[PDB]
Design an enzyme around this catalytic site. Sequence first.
Site, mmCIF file in Angstrom:
data_model
loop_
_atom_site.group_PDB
_atom_site.id
_atom_site.type_symbol
_atom_site.label_atom_id
_atom_site.label_comp_id
_atom_site.label_asym_id
_atom_site.label_seq_id
_atom_site.Cartn_x
_atom_site.Cartn_y
_atom_site.Cartn_z
ATOM 1 N N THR A 119 -3.697 6.652 9.697
ATOM 2 C CA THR A 119 -4.565 6.856 8.555
ATOM 3 C C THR A 119 -4.780 5.584 7.753
ATOM 4 O O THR A 119 -5.504 5.606 6.759
ATOM 5 C CB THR A 119 -4.014 7.973 7.650
ATOM 6 N N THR A 120 -4.168 4.485 8.152
ATOM 7 C CA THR A 120 -4.463 3.198 7.556
ATOM 8 C C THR A 120 -4.905 2.251 8.656
ATOM 9 O O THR A 120 -4.585 2.463 9.837
ATOM 10 C CB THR A 120 -3.237 2.620 6.830
ATOM 11 N N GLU B 276 -2.710 13.421 2.575
ATOM 12 C CA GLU B 276 -3.781 12.977 3.448
ATOM 13 C C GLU B 276 -4.390 14.157 4.187
ATOM 14 O O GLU B 276 -5.607 14.353 4.167
ATOM 15 C CB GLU B 276 -3.231 11.943 4.431
ATOM 16 N N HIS C 205 2.538 9.060 1.009
ATOM 17 C CA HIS C 205 1.246 8.921 0.367
ATOM 18 C C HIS C 205 1.245 9.853 -0.840
ATOM 19 O O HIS C 205 1.745 10.969 -0.751
ATOM 20 C CB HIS C 205 0.106 9.298 1.332
ATOM 21 N N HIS D 90 0.808 -1.214 0.000
ATOM 22 C CA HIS D 90 0.000 0.000 0.000
ATOM 23 C C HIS D 90 0.842 1.264 0.000
ATOM 24 O O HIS D 90 0.298 2.351 -0.222
ATOM 25 C CB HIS D 90 -0.965 0.027 1.196
ATOM 26 N N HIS E 190 7.298 6.851 5.370
ATOM 27 C CA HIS E 190 6.629 6.360 4.177
ATOM 28 C C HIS E 190 5.907 7.552 3.579
ATOM 29 O O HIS E 190 5.845 8.620 4.180
ATOM 30 C CB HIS E 190 5.663 5.212 4.497
ATOM 31 N N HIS F 88 5.365 10.867 5.814
ATOM 32 C CA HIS F 88 5.022 10.604 7.208
ATOM 33 C C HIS F 88 6.232 9.974 7.877
ATOM 34 O O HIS F 88 6.676 8.891 7.468
ATOM 35 C CB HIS F 88 3.801 9.677 7.334
HETATM 36 N N1 LIG Z 1 -0.246 6.713 7.611
HETATM 37 S S1 LIG Z 1 0.249 6.796 9.246
HETATM 38 O O1 LIG Z 1 -0.957 7.369 10.168
HETATM 39 O O2 LIG Z 1 1.579 7.746 9.469
HETATM 40 C C1 LIG Z 1 0.704 5.182 9.880
HETATM 41 C C2 LIG Z 1 1.787 5.085 10.745
HETATM 42 C C3 LIG Z 1 2.157 3.847 11.253
HETATM 43 C C4 LIG Z 1 1.414 2.746 10.906
HETATM 44 O O3 LIG Z 1 1.776 1.513 11.444
HETATM 45 C C5 LIG Z 1 0.323 2.856 10.036
HETATM 46 N N2 LIG Z 1 -0.479 1.697 9.685
HETATM 47 C C6 LIG Z 1 0.120 0.445 9.282
HETATM 48 O O4 LIG Z 1 1.302 0.373 9.223
HETATM 49 N N3 LIG Z 1 -0.754 -0.677 8.960
HETATM 50 C C7 LIG Z 1 -0.278 -1.992 8.542
HETATM 51 C C8 LIG Z 1 -1.324 -3.042 8.963
HETATM 52 C C9 LIG Z 1 -2.491 -3.219 8.213
HETATM 53 C C10 LIG Z 1 -3.427 -4.166 8.615
HETATM 54 N N4 LIG Z 1 -3.229 -4.889 9.694
HETATM 55 C C11 LIG Z 1 -2.135 -4.742 10.427
HETATM 56 C C12 LIG Z 1 -1.142 -3.823 10.100
HETATM 57 C C13 LIG Z 1 -0.041 4.085 9.530
HETATM 58 ZN ZN LIG Z 2 1.096 7.609 6.488
#
Ligand SMILES: NS(=O)(=O)c1ccc(O)c(NC(=O)NCc2ccncc2)c1
Ligand SMILES: [Zn+2]
Length: 257
Positions: A195-196, A103, A93, A61, A91, A116
């Site tokens: 956000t994921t 986002e 977006h 993703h 990472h 991010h």
């Molecule tokens: N965009 S963010 O708010 O900076 C952000 C920062 C750190 C994070 O870990 C995530 N989210 C994930 O990494 N999800 C992977 C996952 C998906 C389904 N099941 C288990 C794990 C988003």
């Molecule tokens: Zn992010």
Amino acid sequence: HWGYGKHNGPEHWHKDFPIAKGERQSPVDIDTHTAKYDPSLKPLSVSYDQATSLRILNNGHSFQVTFDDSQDKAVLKGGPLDGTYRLLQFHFHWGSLDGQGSEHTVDKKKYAAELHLVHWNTKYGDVGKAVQQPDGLAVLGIFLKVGSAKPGLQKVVDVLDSIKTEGKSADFTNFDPRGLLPESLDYWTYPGSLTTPPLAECVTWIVLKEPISVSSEQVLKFRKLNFNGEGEPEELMVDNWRPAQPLKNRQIKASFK
Ligand SMILES: NS(=O)(=O)c1ccc(O)c(NC(=O)NCc2ccncc2)c1
Ligand SMILES: [Zn+2]
């Protein structure tokens, strides 16, 4: 299972992650006229001088660069944070087009991308305990717009060909995260979520006022990545961003008058 298409995209995530309709979800639109300047905020202190990058990975993703977080090597403190937050990964977006991709939005304006940088509160011992805590994570968000090339991004850009499909990783040592920071560290802050999925409500968002500029060739190489793994239908990785969620009972504070 969840993704960013018509059938598994952000409008379906509540079916598996009911917190997607919670009270402090992210991202939000930053209404710059309703944000309050808070003088009780401290300057952001970014101490990335001894950061140790390990790998870059396509996770299907997004793509992600990971860091050695077993020691205080790259930390964030100050700002609205209390304690010391270690850098764990960053990472991006981005969109299919330069008028969408971020986002967070600022006065409803979308940027072409968002960086991010994910940090976690050391008092909780590891990142998996921190994500269950109301203040376990701090994410530094940086907008990208399309203009001149950004030199500190080019090392990332050059390796993307090595991680084109989901699950590929490459060695990525000796990367300097400071090369991705804008000149000013003015910021907005608010309590939010990831956000994921799983969209845990554990994040203190710190969003920088000043965007970094990247060249069109640099962003073109982001869009050449694939959501799919090798040996599958080819789905280009674009529009991997969640739309803005309601602020509800939250105030955004600004660090700058
Ligand atoms: N965009 S963010 O708010 O900076 C952000 C920062 C750190 C994070 O870990 C995530 N989210 C994930 O990494 N999800 C992977 C996952 C998906 C389904 N099941 C288990 C794990 C988003
Ligand atoms: Zn992010």
